[PDB]
Amino acid sequence: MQLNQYTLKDEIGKGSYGVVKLAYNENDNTYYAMKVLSKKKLIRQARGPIEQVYQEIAILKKLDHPNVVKLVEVLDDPNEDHLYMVFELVNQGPVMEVPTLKPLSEDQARFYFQDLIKGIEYLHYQKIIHRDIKPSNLLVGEDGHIKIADFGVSNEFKGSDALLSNTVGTPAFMAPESLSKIFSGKALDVWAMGVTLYCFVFGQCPFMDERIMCLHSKIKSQALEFPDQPDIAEDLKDLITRMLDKNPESRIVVPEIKLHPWVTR
Numbered sequence: 001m002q003l004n005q006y007t008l009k010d011e012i013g014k015g016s017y018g019v020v021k022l023a024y025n026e027n028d029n030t031y032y033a034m035k036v037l038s039k040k041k042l043i044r045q046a047r048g049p050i051e052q053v054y055q056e057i058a059i060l061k062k063l064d065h066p067n068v069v070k071l072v073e074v075l076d077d078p079n080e081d082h083l084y085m086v087f088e089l090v091n092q093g094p095v096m097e098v099p100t101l102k103p104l105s106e107d108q109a110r111f112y113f114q115d116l117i118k119g120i121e122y123l124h125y126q127k128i129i130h131r132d133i134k135p136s137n138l139l140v141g142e143d144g145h146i147k148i149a150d151f152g153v154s155n156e157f158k159g160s161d162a163l164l165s166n167t168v169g170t171p172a173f174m175a176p177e178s179l180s181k182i183f184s185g186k187a188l189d190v191w192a193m194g195v196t197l198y199c200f201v202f203g204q205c206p207f208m209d210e211r212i213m214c215l216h217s218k219i220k221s222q223a224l225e226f227p228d229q230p231d232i233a234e235d236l237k238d239l240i241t242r243m244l245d246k247n248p249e250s251r252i253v254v255p256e257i258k259l260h261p262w263v264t265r
């Protein structure tokens, strides 16, 4: 299929909505990742899915950082059902697959976690709360560095932080204060970064249940416990415990994560 200067090829992946296809650009002889979305399918899937897509378009047009995925072009005719989002091509796999029997080593987890810190610090500096941080939304670029993706449920704010009351995101990564109020958006992202880091070294989420009610009660009430294997350093366990503090008041903040001994060694 030909679309403007692009030759559409096979399906290579999926977004939270839409399919990703390989797209050859005839003008610069470079390949791109093209996310193909049906407006009709987004409407039937119902901030609903179509509002999530247009939020992401609006956020990604304003951002420029080495740890944020690059949106190159949007093809959207208002009288056509399909809209196309063209991104810089990255690795086919994300930072890691979850659940996995082969989790990251501690050096690799530190390297990717340092990228995640830089990316989240930039987003927070740009007044954006991501709200869906997880390994499958952490792409890996040609440079070998993390590129944050999926801005569909993000929130922009004016002032020092976002003071929010709604529950959005991926259930396994949602902070306990959002499942029981007004709460800090930055601390929600810190909790999800904690669930992500736990996933990097254990290959599984810290709180898991097939039943969404039970998953939520575990996030709110199950004390954090580390598996016996793999053995991980005490400083890493200490950092994860502080990021997965159920009380957002006492949860570690990003400036403090940057001075944590596991991060600085």
Ligand SMILES: Cc1ccc(Nc2nsnc(Nc3ccc(C(N)=O)cc3)c2=O)cc1O
Residues within 6 Å of the ligand: 012, 013, 014, 015, 016, 020, 032, 033, 035, 069, 087, 088, 089, 090, 091, 092, 093, 139, 149, 150
């Ligand atoms: C053989 C091969 C095949 C594929 C790839 N690369 C990709 N595969 S899948 N999706 C990608 N990029 C996105 C963009 C946005 C979103 C999103 N969630 O908005 C997710 C992934 C890729 O660049 C690389 C390869 O050498």
Ligand SMILES: [Mg+2]
Residues within 6 Å of the ligand: 093, 094, 095, 096, 097
């Ligand atoms: Mg991999």
